[PDB]
Point group: C3
Chain length 113, copies 3
């Protein structure tokens, strides 16, 4: 069980923190959305929230990551919502399949609940 | 006809403002993208713009929300662009089906028009 | 070969910088994800990164743009990852098919590599 601080960037100017799948998983289009486990857990740095996005090279290989919001105070496991687009997709354990982007969390006076 | 300030957050640390559908709508994959009405209207707080994203629990139930940009000065109704992925999806009136995230709008010297 | 500074906004309050396709391209659902060329190149302004998103009017016409991350220091050509959802889609040369959003790039102590 690892915190976000254990993630790595591909390059200093890379916006994304790479996320791997902890299981070998096979996906087909008729399966629809599947939640892949990452072994990485929230919460995020103060005043930030997260967006999970696909890696372009993975998207182009037929695995669609659906954009997901990670709330600042989420303490569960970060999962990747993914679907094979057209073809059979095989995700091996340790393949980097998504990236976490950190964004400023803006305060508003919207009521909470 | 309601402003964004009428939206609520699920929790203090929730990044998203929840959006409901004001109509009962049935969606099938062969329908392609449909724009669902929310009864909520722009514009946004100064120096901000919006992103519409799916709720994870809704995505996992087979309703794909396509990420949408809400411009700072948009004064129309916020619509959710959505598609049933694999199966028949029934949206009831009042179901929260998307979330609005607020982001900083960066100024640049790009020409306007 | 053009820099991001050559892009235009539709309106002063438009969050997105519009991206065109430099080729006439036909897309069908069975083709899966295709990378469309824009003739626009990174890198981005300092302390920023990019997100490529669909235009709503294009999404509603059946062309799905998959959200893409443009890293701050990317110096290659910005491509649009796109898929025809349900129907045959014809992209003409010069049609604006996506938009680039600029976001703050947050520094963290995550290891780089
Ligand atoms: O891709 C994702 C999306 C969300 N999550 C987690 C983190 C996020 O804080 C949490 C809640 O997600 P959303 O608000 O998008 N989901 P939903 O509105 O269905 O649940 P809730 O009512 O708890 O907010 O689910 C992931 O692990 N992966
Ligand atoms: O999911 C969305 C996306 C956009 N919208 C509205 C708000 C946004 O400001 C407006 C314009 O959207 P985009 O720029 O993405 N659309 P497009 O480029 O086709 O139209 P325009 O030329 O007016 O900018 O449409 C929604 O209500 N829901
Ligand atoms: O839609 C996109 C997405 C990315 N790109 C370019 C810019 C981005 O900096 C670069 C790398 O994209 P990602 O990190 O999402 N891709 P991936 O992780 O597969 O490659 P890398 O290992 O180089 O980071 O590809 C586009 O031109 N269009
Ligand atoms: Mg990458
Ligand atoms: Mg939520
Ligand atoms: Mg536009």
């Amino acid at each position: 069980k690892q915190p976000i601080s254990k993630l790595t960037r591909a390059t200093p100017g890379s916006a994304g923190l790479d996320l791997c799948s902890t299981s070998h998983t096979v996906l087909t289009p008729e399966m629809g959305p599947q939640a892949l486990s990452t072994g990485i857990y929230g919460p995020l740095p103060p005043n930030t929230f997260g967006l999970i996005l696909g890696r372009s090279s993975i998207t182009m290989k037929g695995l669609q990551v659906y954009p997901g919001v990670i709330d600042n105070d989420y303490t569960g496991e970060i999962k990747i919502m993914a679907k094979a687009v057209n073809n059979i997709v095989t995700v091996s354990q340790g393949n980097r399949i998504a990236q976490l982007i950190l964004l400023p969390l803006i305060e508003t006076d919207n009521k909470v609940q």
